Design a protein around this ligand. Structure first.
Ligand SMILES: *[C@@H]1O[C@H](CO)[C@@H](O[C@@H]2O[C@H](CO)[C@@H](O[C@@H]3O[C@H](CO[C@H]4O[C@H](CO[C@H]5O[C@H](CO)[C@@H](O)[C@H](O)[C@@H]5O)[C@@H](O)[C@H](O)[C@@H]4O)[C@@H](O)[C@H](O[C@H]4O[C@H](CO)[C@@H](O)[C@H](O)[C@@H]4O[C@H]4O[C@H](CO)[C@@H](O)[C@H](O)[C@@H]4O[C@H]4O[C@H](CO)[C@@H](O)[C@H](O)[C@@H]4O)[C@@H]3O)[C@H](O)[C@H]2NC(C)=O)[C@H](O)[C@H]1NC(C)=O
Ligand SMILES: *[C@@H]1O[C@H](CO)[C@@H](O[C@@H]2O[C@H](CO)[C@@H](O[C@@H]3O[C@H](CO[C@H]4O[C@H](CO[C@H]5O[C@H](CO)[C@@H](O)[C@H](O)[C@@H]5O)[C@@H](O)[C@H](O[C@H]5O[C@H](CO)[C@@H](O)[C@H](O)[C@@H]5O)[C@@H]4O)[C@@H](O)[C@H](O[C@H]4O[C@H](CO)[C@@H](O)[C@H](O)[C@@H]4O)[C@@H]3O)[C@H](O)[C@H]2NC(C)=O)[C@H](O)[C@H]1NC(C)=O
Ligand SMILES: *[C@@H]1O[C@H](CO)[C@@H](O[C@@H]2O[C@H](CO)[C@@H](O[C@@H]3O[C@H](CO)[C@@H](O)[C@H](O)[C@@H]3O)[C@H](O)[C@H]2NC(C)=O)[C@H](O)[C@H]1NC(C)=O
Ligand SMILES: *[C@@H]1O[C@H](CO)[C@@H](O[C@@H]2O[C@H](CO)[C@@H](O[C@@H]3O[C@H](CO)[C@@H](O)[C@H](O)[C@@H]3O)[C@H](O)[C@H]2NC(C)=O)[C@H](O)[C@H]1NC(C)=O
Ligand SMILES: *[C@@H]1O[C@H](CO)[C@@H](O[C@@H]2O[C@H](CO)[C@@H](O[C@@H]3O[C@H](CO)[C@@H](O)[C@H](O)[C@@H]3O)[C@H](O)[C@H]2NC(C)=O)[C@H](O)[C@H]1NC(C)=O
Ligand SMILES: *[C@@H]1O[C@H](CO)[C@@H](O[C@@H]2O[C@H](CO)[C@@H](O)[C@H](O)[C@H]2NC(C)=O)[C@H](O)[C@H]1NC(C)=O
Ligand SMILES: CC(=O)N[C@@H]1[C@@H](O)[C@H](O)[C@@H](CO)O[C@H]1O
Ligand SMILES: CC(=O)N[C@@H]1[C@@H](O)[C@H](O)[C@@H](CO)O[C@H]1O
Ligand SMILES: CC(=O)N[C@@H]1[C@@H](O)[C@H](O)[C@@H](CO)O[C@H]1O
Ligand SMILES: *[C@@H]1O[C@H](CO)[C@@H](O)[C@H](O)[C@H]1NC(C)=O
Lengths: 48, 240, 42, 213, 96, 148, 76, 148
C-alpha cells in the first residue's frame, strides 16, 4: 500500500502526524518542465 | 522511561494568579491524559482533575471546580515512537491552604478502566504563596572541621542563611563534584522564613590540588553569589 | 550569499507532487501472548 | 477526608504487614478498583500496584495486593528499610478521580543501630558585622531519627531563641534534622563556652565550642 | 499466570516496501484522435470512488529524497517514449 | 476531498489503535490482502495489436507477488493448524526473555507495529517450533492415539 | 474465493452451515421450494442484487465475533 | 566445501530413510515447497530501461508453476478434509489388491519413493473416492443430521 501525509506545514522530511490511507495516487499530470512547475497540486498553506 | 519536567517553584501574593506547566520528554504525550495534585501539610495529598490532549475531556474535583481554567498545546513529534506537546494549567485560588509542592504526571495503558493513573512523575514544583515579598541571598563560609583524624577525613561546608520562599539550590564547582556532597532542608523562624546548613566531607590531604566553590542560587530574587571555602581549619583534632 | 535556479535533473519535477506518497509492505500476521489455548488432545 | 487508614504499622526483617484503609459504601470497598503509592515526603512517588492484585513492572513479587469487601491491603514481604515512608489509598471508577489518604508511615524494628554524627560550627567573624548571630550544629547518620537537643551558654539557664526542625530524610538509610540559636550580641562573650547537647534513648553526646578560640 | 504466544491474521502492520507499482486512470474513449503519450490504452481505469480513510493518531516517517517511486516514475517516462517513437518514421535520409 | 464520516473505520484504520482494538478488526485487512481481481478486471472495464505494453506485464508481475507472499503466509498457518481461522491459540509456553512485560501492558498499552519493533530480532527463531513443538508433534499423537 | 471461505470458517470443507438467521426479505419462499423446485443459476438471478450485502457479515456476526468468544472463554 | 555437521537433517534428508523416519519430517518439506519469495525478492537485493530480459519473465513463469501445482495439490487436500493439517486419517477400508504386505513392512522396511513405485499405476484410481466415499458423502450426513 502507498500512503499519503496530511498536514499542510509539513516540510520535506519527518514523520507526519496527520495520515490517511490511499492505494493509488491522486491525478499526477507528467508535465515536462525545466526550472519551473505548473498546473500541479497546490497546498493550502503559504508555500513552504 | 520518559522524563517530565515542570518549571519554577516560587512566590506569589493571595490576589494574583500564576500558572505552572509540565512537559513530556522521551515519549508520546497526547494519548495519555493530564492531571495535577497537591499534598499540602493541612490536607495531605489531594487530586483535582484531568482533560485529554487529543480532544479534551475534563473531570475536576468539586473542591476546585469554580476557580481553575486551563488549556494545553499541540503535538511536537520526535519520531514515530516519541513526541512532545505543551500543556498549561492556571490556578486562581487566593488561599494559602494550597501552599505545598505541585506535581502533574501521568502514565498508563489507556483502553481499560483505571482510566487516568499518575505514573511517571515530574519535578514537583513547589507553590509558595506569601503576603511577604521576596528576600534575596547573601552567603559566607564554614570553617573545616575534623571528622576522623585516624581516618584522615574532614568536613567543610557553606552558608545557607535565612531567605524567603524555599527551595534554594546550591551546587559546588558548578557540577563535577557530586560524591558525598550533602545539603539539608531549611527551618522556620517564628517571624516566617527559613535557614538550613551545608557541609560535605573530603579527605584532609586534599588542600592544594582541588578547588572547592559553593554557589548560592535563589531564582525569584534572581540572586546567585559564588564563594571560596577557606580550607584552613581551626580544629585542634584536625590540626594534628 | 547569492544563488540561482538550477534544474540540473528533472525528477525534481517528480518530487513536486510525489512527496505525500510512500509505498509500504503488508506484514499482516503477528504473534502475541494471551491466555487462551484449545484442548490438549492427550 | 473520609477514608481512614491505620495510624501506624510495625514489624522487622522478613516483614509482611502493610498499610490498610477503608471507608463507607460511597467510598472504596466493592465496585471500585483501588491502587496505591510509595510517597517519600519531599520526593516524587513510586507505584507498587495499579489494580488490586497485579502490579506495575519494575517492582517485584515482595508486594501482594489482596483485599475483601470492606477495606484494601497490599502485604509487602521480604522488606529492607528502603521501604520506609508513606503508602496512601485510592479508590476510583471509570468516570471519577481517585481519593487519597489521611497519613501513614511504615516503621519496623529489629535493625542494627547507627551512631549519630554531630558537628558544631562557631559563629564566624563576618557575622557580628551585621550584627546578628546564630549557632548551628546539625545531626545526621542516626536512626531511630527521633531526638531532643538543647541549648546552653555557660551551663546556666538560657531561655530565649532556639528553633529546631522536623527531620527530613534523603540518605540511603539514615536520617537528619536541624537546630540552632538566635542572638543578642554581647550576652555570649558574657559566657565562657558553649554546648549543643544531643540526647538519644541509647546515649547522650554533647559538643562544646570555646569561642575565645 | 501462564502465558502462551498466539497468532493473528490481519494485523495493521507495515514495512518500508520496495516493489513495482502500476498506473490507473479513468479511460477516455476519445475516438476522434488517438494514442496518448503515456496512458495510451493500457493503464487500468480508476475505480468510481478511490477510498480515502484517516489513520488516527498515527505518525510515520517520510523521506522524499531517497524515495523510489520517482526513480520509477521517470524510469517509465523515458521508457515508453522509446516505444512511442519506434513505430514512427525514421529520419535519416534527411541529414543530407 | 472534504472528509465524510459514514463508515468505520477501514483497512489499517486500527493501526493507530492499541492491539486490543485492532485484534477485533482483523478482517478489514484479510480481504484487502489478496484481492487483485476486484481492482483489476480480466477484461477491460482496436488499433492496438497485442498488449505487451509494460503497463501490461509489470502489472502482471505484481498480481502474483500479491498472492505468493499471501500464499506462503497462509502456508505458515497451514503449518501451525489455523488455515481458515484468523486468530490461533498455542501450546508451548512463552518464556519471556523476548519481552518482560504483562498481558494488559500490550493490548491496552501498545499497538501491533509497536510490538513487532521490539521482538523483530526474535521473530525467526520463534517460528522454528510454533509448529514443531505445536503441530509436528501434535499429530503423531493422534496418530499413535487414534491408533486404537 | 477460497479466502472468503477462510473468512467464514470453511477452508477445507465445501458446504458450510451458518449461525445468523435468514430474515427472508431476500426471498419469501420455502425450503423444499428451492432444492426440489429451482436450480442454482435460478436462485442467484433473484438475489443477485442482495449478494454483496449478505457477505458483509456471514463473517462478522458469524466468525469475527465467533472467536473473541473462545478467546474470552478459553480464557479459563 | 568441507562438510559441516551442525544441522539435521534437511529438505529431503529423510528420502534415504524409511517412511516412519520421514513421516516425522514432513515440515522440512512443506516450507521449501512454495516459498518463491524468500529466495526471490520483489525488489533487487540505471542504464537499463525495462527488465524484459528473459531472465525476467522465464523466472516469472517459474514462480506461478511453483504455486499452482502446490495450489492444486492443497486443493486435493481441501477435497479430502485436511487443509491445514499435513497428515490425514481415512475412513474407507484398504482392500489390499494394491499391496499385499503389512503395516511394519513399509514404514520400517521401505521408503516413500520405494512405495510410490509399486502403486504408481493404482494412484489415480484411489484418488477417485478418498473424497467421495470419504467426504462427498461425509457431510450430507451432518447436513441431514445437524438437520435437527
Ligand atoms: C495548464 O492548464 C491549461 C488548462 O487546461 C492547459 O491548457 C490546455 O492546453 C492544451 C494545449 O497544450 C489544449 O489542448 C488543445 O486545445 C485546443 C483548443 O481547444 C479548443 O476547442 C475545444 C473544443 O474542441 C476540442 O474538443 C473537441 C471535443 O470536445 C475535439 O473534437 C476538438 O478536436 C478539439 O480538441 C474548446 O472546448 C476549447 O475551449 C478550445 O476553444 C484543441 O484544439 C487541441 O486539439 C488538437 O490538438 C491535440 C494535440 O495534438 C490533438 O490531440 C487533437 O486531436 C487536436 O488535433 C486535431 O485537430 C487539429 C485541428 O486543426 C488538427 O490540426 C490536428 O492535425 C488534429 O486533426 C487530425 O486528427 C483528427 C482526429 O483524428 C482528425 O479529425 C483530423 O482530420 C486530423 O487527421 C488540444 O485539445 C487544451 O485544450 C488546454 N486546456 C483547455 C481546458 O482548453 C495548459 O496546456 C496547461 N499547461 C501545460 C504546461 O500543460
Ligand atoms: C487519538 O487520541 C485519543 C486520546 O489521546 C484516543 O482516545 C481515547 O480512546 C480510549 C479508547 O476508547 C478511551 O478509553 C475509554 O474512555 C472512556 C471515556 O470516559 C468517559 O467518561 C469521561 C469522564 O466523564 C466524567 O466527567 C464528567 C464531567 O466532564 C462528569 O459529569 C461525569 O459524571 C464523569 O464523572 C467522559 O468525558 C467521556 O466522554 C468522552 O467519551 C465518550 C465515549 O465514551 C464520547 O461520547 C464523549 O463525546 C467524549 O468524547 C466518557 O464518557 C471510558 O468510559 C472507557 O472506560 C469504559 O471502557 C472500558 C474499556 O475500554 C471498560 O473497561 C470500562 O468498564 C468502561 O466501560 C475507556 O477508559 C479514552 O478515554 C480516549 N481518550 C483519551 C485517552 O484521552 C483516540 O482513540 C486516539 N485515536 C485512535 C484511533 O485510537
Ligand atoms: C534485537 O536483537 C539484537 C541482537 O541481539 C540486538 O542488537 C544488539 O544490541 C546491542 C546493544 O545492547 C549492541 O551491543 C553494542 O555493541 C557495542 C560494540 O559493537 C558496544 O560498545 C555497546 O556498548 C553495545 O554493547 C549489539 O551490537 C547489537 N547487535 C546487533 C547484531 O544488532 C538489539 O538490541 C535487539 N533489539 C531489541 C529492541 O531488543
Ligand atoms: C434487485 O434489486 C434491485 C434494486 O432494488 C431492483 O431494481 C429495481 O426494480 C424496480 C422495479 O420494481 C425499479 O423501479 C421502477 O422504477 C421506475 C422509475 O424509474 C418506475 O416507474 C417503475 O414503476 C418501477 O417502480 C427500479 O428502478 C430498479 N432499480 C434498480 C437500481 O435496478 C430489482 O427489481 C431487484 N430484482 C429482483 C429480482 O428482486
Ligand atoms: C502397474 O500396473 C500395470 C497395468 O496393469 C502393470 O503393467 C502390466 O504388466 C504386465 C506384466 O505382469 C504386462 O503383461 C505382459 O504382457 C505381455 C504381452 O504384451 C506378455 O507376454 C507378458 O507375459 C506379460 O503378461 C502388461 O503388458 C503391463 N501393462 C501395462 C499397461 O504396462 C504393471 O505390472 C504394474 N506394476 C506394478 C509394480 O504392480
Ligand atoms: C488553474 O487554477 C485554478 C485555481 O486557481 C484551478 O481551479 C479553477 O478555479 C477557478 C476559481 O479559482 C474556477 O473558476 C475553475 O472552474 C477551476 N477549474 C477547474 C478545472 O477546477 C484550475 O483547475 C487550474 N487549471 C488547470 C489545472 O488546468
Ligand atoms: C524453556 C525454553 O525453551 N527456554 C529457552 C531456552 O532453552 C533458550 O536458551 C533461551 C534463549 O533465549 O530461550 C528460552
Ligand atoms: C434482523 C435483521 O438484521 N434484519 C434486517 C434489517 O435490520 C434490515 O433493515 C433489512 C434490510 O432489508 O434486512 C433485515
Ligand atoms: C470393496 C471394494 O471396493 N473392492 C474393490 C473392488 O470393487 C474392485 O473390483 C477392485 C479392483 O481391483 O478393487 C477392490
Ligand atoms: C506484570 O508485570 C510484572 C513485570 O515482570 C510481572 O512480573 C507480572 O507477573 C505481570 N503480571 C502478570 C499477571 O503476569
Amino acid at each position: 500500500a502507498i500512503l499519503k501525509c496530511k498536514d499542510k506545514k509539513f516540510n520535506g522530511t519527518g514523520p507526519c502526524p496527520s495520515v490517511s490511507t490511499v492505494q493509488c495516487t491522486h491525478g499526477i499530470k507528467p508535465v515536462v518542465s525545466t526550472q519551473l512547475l505548473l498546473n500541479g497540486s497546490l497546498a493550502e498553506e503559504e508555500v513552504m | 522511561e520518559g522524563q517530565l519536567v515542570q518549571s519554577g517553584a516560587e512566590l506569589k501574593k493571595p490576589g494574583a494568579s500564576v500558572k505552572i506547566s509540565c512537559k513530556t520528554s522521551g515519549y508520546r504525550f497526547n494519548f495519555y491524559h493530564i492531571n495535577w495534585i497537591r499534598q499540602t501539610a493541612g490536607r495531605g495529598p489531594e487530586w483535582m482533575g484531568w482533560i485529554s490532549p487529543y480532544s479534551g475531556d475534563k473531570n475536576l474535583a468539586p473542591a476546585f471546580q469554580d476557580r481553575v481554567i486551563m488549556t494545553t498545546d499541540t503535538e511536537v513529534p520526535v519520531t514515530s515512537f516519541t513526541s512532545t506537546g505543551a500543556a498549561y494549567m492556571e490556578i486562581r485560588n487566593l488561599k494559602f491552604d494550597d501552599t505545598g509542592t505541585y506535581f502533574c504526571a501521568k502514565g498508563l495503558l489507556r483502553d481499560g478502566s483505571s482510566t487516568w493513573l499518575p505514573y511517571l512523575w515530574g519535578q514537583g514544583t513547589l507553590l509558595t504563596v506569601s503576603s511577604a515579598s521576596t528576600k534575596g541571598p547573601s552567603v559566607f563560609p564554614l570553617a573545616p572541621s575534623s571528622k576522623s583524624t585516624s581516618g584522615g577525613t574532614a568536613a567543610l561546608g557553606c552558608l545557607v542563611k535565612d531567605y524567603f520562599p524555599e527551595p534554594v539550590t546550591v551546587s559546588w564547582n558548578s557540577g563535577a563534584l557530586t560524591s558525598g556532597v550533602h545539603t539539608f532542608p531549611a527551618v522556620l523562624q517564628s517571624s516566617g522564613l527559613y535557614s538550613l546548613s551545608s557541609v560535605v566531607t573530603v579527605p584532609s590531604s586534599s588542600l592544594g590540588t582541588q578547588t572547592y566553590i559553593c554557589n548560592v542560587n535563589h531564582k525569584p530574587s534572581n540572586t546567585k553569589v559564588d564563594k571560596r571555602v577557606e580550607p584552613k581549619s581551626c580544629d585542634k583534632g584536625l590540626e594534628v | 550569499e547569492t544563488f540561482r535556479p538550477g534544474g540540473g535533473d528533472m525528477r525534481d519535477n517528480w518530487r513536486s507532487e510525489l512527496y505525500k506518497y510512500k509505498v509500504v509492505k503488508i506484514e499482516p500476521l503477528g504473534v502475541a501472548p494471551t491466555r487462551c489455548k484449545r484442548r490438549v488432545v492427550g | 477526608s473520609v477514608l481512614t487508614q491505620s495510624a501506624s504499622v510495625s514489624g522487622s526483617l522478613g516483614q509482611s504487614v502493610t498499610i490498610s484503609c477503608t471507608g463507607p459504601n460511597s467510598v472504596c470497598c466493592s465496585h471500585k478498583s483501588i491502587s496505591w503509592y510509595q510517597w517519600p515526603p519531599g520526593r516524587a512517588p513510586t507505584l507498587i500496584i495499579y489494580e488490586d492484585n497485579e502490579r506495575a513492572p519494575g517492582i517485584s513479587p515482595r508486594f501482594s495486593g489482596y483485599k475483601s469487601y470492606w477495606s484494601a491491603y497490599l502485604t509487602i514481604s521480604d522488606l529492607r528499610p528502603e521501604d520506609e515512608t508513606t503508602y496512601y489509598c485510592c479508590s476510583y471508577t471509570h468516570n471519577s478521580g481517585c481519593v487519597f489518604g489521611t497519613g501513614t508511615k511504615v516503621s519496623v524494628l529489629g535493625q542494627s543501630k547507627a551512631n549519630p554524627s554531630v558537628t558544631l560550627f562557631p559563629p564566624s567573624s563576618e557575622e557580628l558585622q551585621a550584627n546578628k548571630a546564630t549557632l548551628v550544629c546539625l545531626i545526621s547518620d542516626f536512626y531511630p531519627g527521633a531526638v531532643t537537643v538543647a541549648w546552653k551558654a555557660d551551663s546556666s539557664p538560657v531561655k530565649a531563641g532556639v528553633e529546631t526542625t522536623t527531620p527530613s530524610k534523603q540518605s540511603n538509610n539514615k536520617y537528619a534534622a536541624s537546630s540552632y540559636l538566635s542572638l543578642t550580641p554581647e550576652q555570649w562573650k558574657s559566657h565562657r563556652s558553649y554546648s549543643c547537647q544531643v540526647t538519644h534513648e541509647g546515649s547522650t553526646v554533647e559538643k562544646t565550642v570555646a569561642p575565645t578560640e | 499466570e501462564n502465558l502462551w504466544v498466539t497468532v493473528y491474521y490481519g494485523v495493521p502492520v507495515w514495512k518500508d516496501a520496495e516493489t513495482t507499482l502500476f498506473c490507473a486512470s479513468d479511460a477516455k474513449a476519445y475516438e476522434t484522435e488517438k494514442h496518448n503519450v503515456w496512458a495510451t490504452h493500457a493503464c487500468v481505469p480508476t475505480d468510481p470512488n478511490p477510498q480515502e480513510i484517516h489513520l488516527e493518531n498515527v505518525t510515520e516517517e517520510f523521506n522524499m529524497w531517497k524515495n523510489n517511486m520517482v526513480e520509477q516514475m521517470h524510469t517509465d517516462i523515458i521508457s515508453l517514449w522509446d516505444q512511442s517513437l519506434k513505430p514512427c518514421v525514421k529520419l535519416t535520409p534527411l541529414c543530407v | 476531498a472534504v472528509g465524510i464520516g459514514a463508515v468505520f473505520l477501514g483497512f489499517l484504520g486500527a493501526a493507530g489503535s492499541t492491539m486490543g482494538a485492532a485484534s477485533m478488526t482483523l478482517t478489514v485487512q484479510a480481504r484487502n490482502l489478496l484481492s487483485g481481481i476486484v481492482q483489476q478486471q480480466s477484461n477491460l472495464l482496436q488499433q492496438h495489436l497485442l498488449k505487451l505494453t509494460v503497463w501490461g506485464i509489470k502489472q502482471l508481475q505484481a498480481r502474483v507477488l500479491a498472492v505468493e507472499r499471501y500464499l506462503r503466509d497462509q502456508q505458515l498457518l497451514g503449518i501451525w493448524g489455523c488455515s481458515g481461522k484468523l486468530i490461533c491459540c498455542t501450546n508451548v509456553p512463552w518464556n519471556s526473555s523476548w519481552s518482560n512485560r504483562n498481558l494488559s501492558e500490550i493490548w491496552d498499552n501498545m499497538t501491533w507495529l509497536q510490538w513487532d519493533k521490539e521482538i523483530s530480532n526474535y521473530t525467526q527463531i520463534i517460528y522454528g517450533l510454533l509448529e514443531e513443538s505445536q503441530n509436528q508433534q501434535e499429530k503423531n499423537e493422534q496418530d499413535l492415539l487414534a491408533l486404537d
